[PDB]
């Protein structure tokens, strides 16, 4: 699906994904993630692979734009993300963006 974000088109909005379970190195944080993960994205905004020369740049945009857009939309519904929430969203959305890169790369 094509998309416009922040006034720029040429984005794609990926499919709704099975959001991975991320581990953080304590059981507490792992449980916090399980209890909160429904608040985090399950789909990612990205741009065509050919607009980058490397994987890290593709993934950086995907993480950055996805979380920006998610924060806008969810703020309008009364959400507020803690520092911990932001960190955890960065980690899961990074994984989902790397998975998407690998789909683009094998195509």
């Amino acid at each position, epitope marked *: 699906a094509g998309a416009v*974000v*922040g*006034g*720029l088109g*040429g984005y794609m909005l990926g499919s709704a994904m099975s959001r991975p379970i991320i581990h953080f190195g304590s059981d507490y944080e792992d449980r916090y993630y399980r209890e909160n993960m429904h608040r985090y994205p399950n789909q990612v905004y990205y*741009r*065509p692979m*050919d*607009e*980058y*020369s*490397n994987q*890290n*740049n*593709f993934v*950086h*945009d995907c993480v*950055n*734009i996805t979380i*920006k857009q998610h924060t806008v939309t969810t703020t309008t519904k009364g959400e507020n993300f803690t520092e911990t929430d932001v960190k955890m969203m960065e980690r899961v959305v990074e994984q989902m963006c790397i998975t998407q890169y690998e789909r683009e790369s094998q195509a």
Partner: nanobody, 124 residues
Framework: AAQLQESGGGLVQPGGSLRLSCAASGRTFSSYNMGWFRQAPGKGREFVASITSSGDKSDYTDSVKGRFTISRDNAKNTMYLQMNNLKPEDTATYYC?????????????????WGQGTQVTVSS
């Protein structure tokens, strides 16, 4: 028709330093995010660094982070790229460009108004 023009390129020894400039015509410089890209023969144009309209945030590609510094002088319609600890792999034509949309990104499609470029060659 805002026009961008790069300058400051040259031939630099490895480990050397160069400062590039990007001069903008017109009267809306400070209203737009801006970025630097580079292109070497055989490769496509790739992200180097970016800076928001107000200068409040900047961004870099991994391979130049810590060596290169982007800045802008909003009173003088000019952006700069300070390139330190230059390496052979930094050889390229460097382009400045104006951001599209409200967010600085790394993608080629995030910018337009490309200048004609300035050549940087780092010897080896």
């Amino acid at each position: 028709a805002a026009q961008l023009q790069e300058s400051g390129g040259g031939l630099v020894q490895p480990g050397g330093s160069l400062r590039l400039s990007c001069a903008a015509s017109g009267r809306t410089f400070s209203s737009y995010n801006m970025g630097w890209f580079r292109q070497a023969p055989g490769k496509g144009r790739e992200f180097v660094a970016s800076i928001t309209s107000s200068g409040d945030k900047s961004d870099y590609t991994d391979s130049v982070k810590g060596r290169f510094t982007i800045s802008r002088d909003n009173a003088k319609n000019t952006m700069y790229l300070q390139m330190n600890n230059l390496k052979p792999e930094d050889t390229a034509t460097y382009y400045c460009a104006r951001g599209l949309g409200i967010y600085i990104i790394r993608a080629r499609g995030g910018y337009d108004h490309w200048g004609q470029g300035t050549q940087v060659t780092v010897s080896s």
